[PDB]
Symmetry: C4
Subunit: 216 residues, 4 copies
Amino acid sequence: PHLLKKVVSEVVATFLLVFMTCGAAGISGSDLSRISQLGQSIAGGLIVTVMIYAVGHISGAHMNPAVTLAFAVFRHFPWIQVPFYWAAQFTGAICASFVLKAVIHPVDVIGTTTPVGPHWHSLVVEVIVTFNMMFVTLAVATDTRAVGELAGLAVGSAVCITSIFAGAISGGSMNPARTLGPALASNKFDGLWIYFLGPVMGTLSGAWTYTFIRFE
Amino acid sequence: PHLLKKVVSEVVATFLLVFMTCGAAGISGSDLSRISQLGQSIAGGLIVTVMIYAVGHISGAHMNPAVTLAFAVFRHFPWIQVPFYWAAQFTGAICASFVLKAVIHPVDVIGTTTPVGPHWHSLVVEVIVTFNMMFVTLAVATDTRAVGELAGLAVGSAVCITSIFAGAISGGSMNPARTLGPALASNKFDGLWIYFLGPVMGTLSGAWTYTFIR
Amino acid sequence: PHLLKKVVSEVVATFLLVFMTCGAAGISGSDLSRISQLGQSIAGGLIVTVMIYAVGHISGAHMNPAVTLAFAVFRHFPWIQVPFYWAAQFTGAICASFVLKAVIHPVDVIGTTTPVGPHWHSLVVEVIVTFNMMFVTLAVATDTRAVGELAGLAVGSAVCITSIFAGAISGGSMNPARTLGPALASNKFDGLWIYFLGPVMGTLSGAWTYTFIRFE
Amino acid sequence: PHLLKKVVSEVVATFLLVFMTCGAAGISGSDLSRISQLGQSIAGGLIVTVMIYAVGHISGAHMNPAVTLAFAVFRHFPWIQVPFYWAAQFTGAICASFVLKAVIHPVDVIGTTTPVGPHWHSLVVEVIVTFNMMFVTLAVATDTRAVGELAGLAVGSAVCITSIFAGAISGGSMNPARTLGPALASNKFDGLWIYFLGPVMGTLSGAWTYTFIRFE
């Protein structure tokens, strides 16, 4: 039901998503005098917001398979469309990290999200922060799909918190599509089981938690 | 009046409040290479803002026993409900910091708030900056409770100012539930009373100053 | 004309203005490990924003003698009230820096807006950056007086631009009330005229420029 | 069609645009002790946001000839006015960077935008970050011209992201008038062509991508 412009918007968003979000964390993860560490989180959070303004009213700016999933679980999102977005997201992302592999000549750690210390630390973090994000994503979404000025602020804000804090433990992802892309350009795949089960379990738990308390 | 979903909202918010705000101040106060010092202030303000968008229209997104007190005094909040939130906040906070003592294993100062100079520095700050916070919280609440896009911007900003400045003196808390959780998940109960009297005297004073200039 | 509650809002705002903006600038300019330098800009701009949300609909959130003057000149504000407000701003600032002198014992330059090198560098910056403020302050004012969600964003943002850049040259004040407060509790009185001729001459010029382009 | 107030509004912005975005980038680009590296990215973004609040409803706050262009191709902007804004931007930029040359006397690199590595690195960034900017500029435009509270947040956000990331590769400009202004104020012209193809080739690309996904 009008899924072409939805998926072009979902790919073009996920590309500019990953291209920006890793390219500052990857560059920063190679010279912190070149791009600040708080600067790679702020950059990563701002970019989520502007894609909600760009494609939020068209596709919904899902950009996140564990979110497209969470919408299909809780607010009636077309199950016949979730494969098309999942596809659309993984594509724009994986494409980007390679596009940067070439634009950031010296550095070949393109924002790897790899667990720090005990691998489970990340999982508890990657569910609590993903829960957090999906929780607020759901309290602000308008069902065309995550639309509007404050939807951009809420989700971008949540995401930014994740880079600052969950970045010290998990690297801070919450998005199976965005760990995978970079993991391929730098061939480091340490702990990927957590960047699927943290999120999928984080979005569904947090989304479920919202529908619980839903009306006042 | 329909308080089950309200107190679930007040724990899940105060938990997510402390979990990120302390989880980042705890990591940061251990390796400033691992999390920035300005990043743990920003973290503190953003989490308040997004929690206002998520539970603000349901519970009121108080996430603070010294505020639920302050609204019940001035802007008609249910007194049979203030024990019930105090329960929800002190819980979600105490619950949160413990989840972190473990999730940030090796670091065990779980973002606590303890005075820096003479304790009255903190107490005077923890009333002036807390006076500040409740002041604007009260000017933007619409009474369902602290709800709406700019309600989140105001409070998040206020909290963010507090981490930066009151962080140098008091640690910048303004929230008794957020002090106990951490003070308990590790230890140190240093100045624990100013983080109970600074706030309660700060939120009530700040609310009264606004209700005056209405 | 109903000026009683109007002027209390202007001291509590100007007090809370300086208590944070100087109280963080004073600590920070002393141990840059104790409070970040980017953190002292962000702090100072945020506080302007929250005061505009607090008292903007009551007083207008002037907090600035170069503002109350400029509103009195261009968007018809009461001359019977410009003295009563000018009082409220010079007080809340002077009171705060002293209230700070004690809460921050070891540090005793309680914020300083003091020129860097050539004094004319500061006066030129202190009118152009002050031009920035009054220009936008006027484009977003609703005349009850600087009211509304984006009034807080516009002005708060502008002030933050000033701390970052004009902080490197002048210290970034734009405020006759804000220079006096710290200069009295810190007891450093350099260039005090540029913080009266920079501001007073900067806002009047910037307001005139908005009233000029007023139409599209 | 009522262009006097329109072009005076376009210069005063581009003056205050460059005066601060470079005045902080230059001061920062010398002594990072006097202005932080993230502070000159943030400042670069706040100024775009507040200028949209000041002149967005009058001229539209393009502040960018490659953007003033980008609107003429896609959302019907007066070709008899494209010269008059181009003039206005190239003017206010060149004038401002000179105003600072003198106001920051011992430091005389007045916030230049100069490439880093392979010049194609810089250019490839200056189109995708410029693509990003124009893409969202288009999803939030209201046509009098880029007006409104969230219009400022998106555009300023796009700019702030670019300074963080594209500053590490291209210097992060996306604006031919803003590369020229500083380049003249202290003699520097390396890769000046990417800052004329990065933008022009970048804004047009980003706009078309939205007009594609125009609907839902």
